[PDB]
Symmetry: D2
Subunit: 248 residues, 4 copies
C-alpha cells in the first residue's frame, strides 16, 4: 500500500462529494491513517461519520481565520502521533455573489477574506506542519486553471489561486531542504452560479471529453502524497481531462 | 508626442529615482498632462517639486487602504479634467523585516497589508479609473520576476505579485470592451536587504549584461500608455534585460 | 521618427496585407531605411513595387533553405550599408492541406520543411545578421498563440512556433552581450480582404478577446515599431501578445 | 500491481542507467509486460539482456527516421499482443559537439535531425500506437527545463524539447477522445556512474539550488513514469510534469 505507515491531516472535508474526500478515501485505501478537522460545530455532525467511514481521527475544530484553532489542531496531532507525514490543504472561500459579478467590482473585505482563507491558510498550516514533519513529507493544496487564465464566475478567486500557486513555489523552497514537498493539483470542474455551462464546456472541449471526478482527483492526490512523487515539488499539476492545453 | 493630448494619473511617485518617475518623465516628454497623488504630509513636501518639474497637477493625498481617499482623488480629477486616458499604478509595500527571512514565517498582518496595498489597490483605483475612462485608455502596473519564480529576499511580495499579474488578466477582460487596456511591466532590479548581489547577478547573467534603468523602463511604460500598444492588453511584459529567459 | 538613422532587413514581405508589410510600413513612417528580400521569380514581380512604395532596397533572392542565398543577401547588405540596425523575420510555411487534418497525421516532409522554414531560418539569418550588428540591434520574429495552447487549423505550425519562441530565448542569450535584442510578437489572427475555417477563428477572437476585435497589421506594425525602436532596449527574449488580449482567455 | 494486466512499449532502452530503464524497471515491478525496441546504433545483443532482465519481448529494431521501421515494430506488437496499453518515448538526439557551441551556430543538418529524431518521432510513433490503443492508454515522453528556459549545453535540444512539449499538447487533443493520454516528464539532470561537457557543474548547481537539495535519480523518475502509465493519472493529459527536485521554480 502506497501510504502504508503514513499519517496525514486533511483540512476541508465537509461532505462525501468533495475533492478533499476523494483524496482522503484514496489515501486511506493506500493505507494512510488520517486526521480530519471540521469547520464549526454545524459541520462536526456531518464530519464525524465521514471520519468513522475512513477510520479518521477527528483532530478538532479548525477555522483557518483563527490562529488559535490551528495551533490546537496541531497540539492534538503532536500528542497523538508526534509526527505528520502529509498534509492536504483543501480550504477555499470566496464571496458567492461577487463571483457572478465583474472582477473589477470586487469589494475589499471579500478580497482580503478570500486571500486570507484561500491563500494564507496554507502558509499558516504549513508553518506548523513543519514542526511535525522533520523526517520529511508532502503538503498538497488545490487550485484551478482560473489562476492562469480568465475563467468565468471565478473573479477574485482567480487572483487568490494565482497567489496560492506562487506561495506553493516559495513554500517548496523553504521546506524542500527538510525533504518536505509542496504541490498543488489544478482540478477541472467536477459534477456536483452558472456551473452547468462550465461543466458542459469541459465535457465537449477537454481532450478526454469528460469532466473529472473526485476519484480521479483523489488518485492524483494519492500520487502527490505517496513516494512516487518523491522528486516533485513546487508543482501545479493539472487533473482536468487535459483542459488547460485548449486555447480555443 | 506619442502621448500628446492625453492626461494620466501616476500613483507612487515619492522621489526622482523610481520607475514611476521614469515613466512620468518619459510620459511628460511625450506630451502627456500628468497628475500625481502623494501619501502623507512627509511625502507632500517631496512630491510638490517633482510635480513642478513635469507640470504635474497634484491631485491630493491617496492611501489605498483608505477608500475615501481614492474617491477624493478621482472626484478631484473628474473636476479638473473630466477624463483620464491612462493610469500608472506604481504602489507596493511589504514589511521590510519579513522579506529577509523565510516566506513560511510571513505574518498574517504583513500578508494582508501587502495584498491590500500591492494588489487590491490596482483593482480599487481601476474601478474608479473606469468612470473617467469610458471612451478608452491604458492602465499600467509594475511587477517582478518573483511573481513567476522564487527570487531571494522577496517572499510574500512574490505571492502578491502573482496575484497582481493574475488581477491584470481579470481587469483586462472587465475593461477591454470599453477599450481600456490593462498591462504590467515586469521590471528587473534597478540601481538606486541584500540588493547588491541581486543587481550583480542580473548584471552578469542577464542576456544584455546590464541591470535596467528607470529611463529604460519609463520608455517601456511610454509604449504601454501610447497607442503603439493598443492591441495589447492583459500582458506581463519583461523589461529586465532578458533576465527572465535564464534557467541557470 | 523613432527609427530615424536606422537600417533594417525585412524578410517575408510578399504582399501589402501581411504583418511584415505592416511592420515595414510603420518602420518606414518612423524614418527607417528598409531592405526587402524575395523568394520566387514570381515574388520578385510582387516585392519590387512594394519596395518602391517604401523606398526599400531589394536585397535579392533568399531561399531560406539555400544557405548560399542567405550569405549572398547579407553580403549585398554589407557592401551597401556596412551595418544593420534591425531585422524582421516574418518567414514561415507549413502544408496548407495538413493544417486542416489532425496534427497526429502530420507528414515527416511537412514537419521537417515547416521546422526548417519557420524556425531554423531565424537562426540561420540571425547568424549572418550578427556580423553586421556589432554596434547592437534588434531582431524581431512573429509567432501565434497556437505555440502555447492547442489552436484549430494550426497543427504542426504550433509545434514549430513553440520551437521558434524557444529559439528566440536561446538566440537572446547568444546575442545580448553584443547588445542585440531578439524578440517575437505573438500576433492574433488578422482579417484579410483577399481570397479552412479561418473566418470562424476570427469571429471567436472578435467576440472573446477582451478588446472585442481582431488586431490589424497597422496595430501589429506599431508593436513591431516598438521592438525595432530604442523604447524596447531593455526587452529581449520576450514573446509579446499583440492579440487584443485573447491570450488571457481561458474559456 | 499498478500496471497489472498492462502491456506497453518502451522505446530508447540502450543501457541500465537511463530514465527509459528506470521507467521500464518501475513498470515491470508494477506488473507490466514490456516490449523493447533497439534504437539506431543499439545492438540487438545489447538490448536483449536488458529485455530479459524484465522478461521484455524485443519488438525489433526501430529507426525513427524510417517510417517503415516504425510500422514493422507496431505490426510485430499487433501480431503478438493485438492491443497496447502504453508507450514510453525516450528517444532524443542532437549532435554532441554543437551542444558545447553557441545555439546560433547550430548547423541546418543538426537542427533537422534533432527535430526529426527528438520531436517528430513521438508524433510518428503515437500515430501507429493509436491504432493499438482503441480502448485507450498512456503515451509518455521525456523533456527538460531547457525547453522553457535557456539552460547550458543544450542549445538546439532546448528548441527541440520546446517543440516536443507543444506536440504533447496537440497529440493530447487528437488522442484524448479515444481515451489516450499523452504526457511529458520534465526530468532534472541525473548523476551517472558511467564515463564522463560541463555536466558536473549542472548537477552540482541543481544539487545546491533545487528546493530538495539533490539531483533526481532514474528510480525517482521511473516512479513518476509509473504514475503516468498507471490509471492514477487518468485525469491527466497534455501535461509537462517536473520530476526535478523542484528546480523549475527557482528564479535565481
Amino acid at each position: 500500500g502506497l501510504l502504508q505507515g503514513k499519517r496525514g491531516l486533511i483540512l476541508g472535508v465537509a461532505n462525501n462529494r468533495s475533492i478533499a474526500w476523494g483524496i482522503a478515501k484514496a489515501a486511506r485505501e493506500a493505507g494512510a491513517e488520517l486526521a480530519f478537522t471540521y469547520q464549526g460545530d454545524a459541520l462536526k455532525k456531518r464530519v464525524e461519520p465521514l471520519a468513522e467511514e475512513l477510520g479518521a481521527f477527528v483532530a478538532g475544530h479548525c477555522d483557518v481565520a483563527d490562529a488559535a484553532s490551528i495551533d490546537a489542531v496541531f497540539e492534538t496531532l503532536e500528542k497523538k502521533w508526534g509526527k505528520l507525514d502529509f498534509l492536504v490543504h483543501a480550504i477555499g472561500f470566496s464571496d458567492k455573489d461577487e463571483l457572478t459579478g465583474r472582477y473589477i467590482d470586487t469589494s475589499e473585505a471579500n478580497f482580503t477574506n478570500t486571500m486570507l482563507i484561500s491563500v494564507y491558510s496554507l502558509t499558516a498550516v504549513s508553518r506548523r506542519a513543519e514542526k511535525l514533519m522533520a523526517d520529511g513529507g508532502s503538503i498538497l493544496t488545490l487550485t484551478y486553471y482560473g489562476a492562469e487564465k480568465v475563467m468565468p464566475n471565478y473573479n477574485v478567486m482567480g487572483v487568490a489561486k494565482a497567489a496560492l500557486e506562487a506561495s506553493v513555489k516559495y513554500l517548496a523552497v523553504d521546506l524542500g531542504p527538510q525533504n518536505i514537498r509542496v504541490n498543488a493539483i489544478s482540478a477541472g470542474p467536477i459534477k456536483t452560479g452558472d456551473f452547468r455551462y462550465i461543466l458542459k464546456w469541459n465535457e465537449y472541449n477537454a481532450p478526454l471529453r469528460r469532466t473529472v471526478t473526485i476519484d480521479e482527483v483523489g488518485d492524483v492526490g494519492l500520487y502527490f502524497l505517496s513516494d512516487l512523487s518523491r522528486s516533485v515539488t513546487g508543482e501545479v499539476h493539472h487533473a482536468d481531462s487535459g483542459y488547460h492545453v485548449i486555447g480555443m
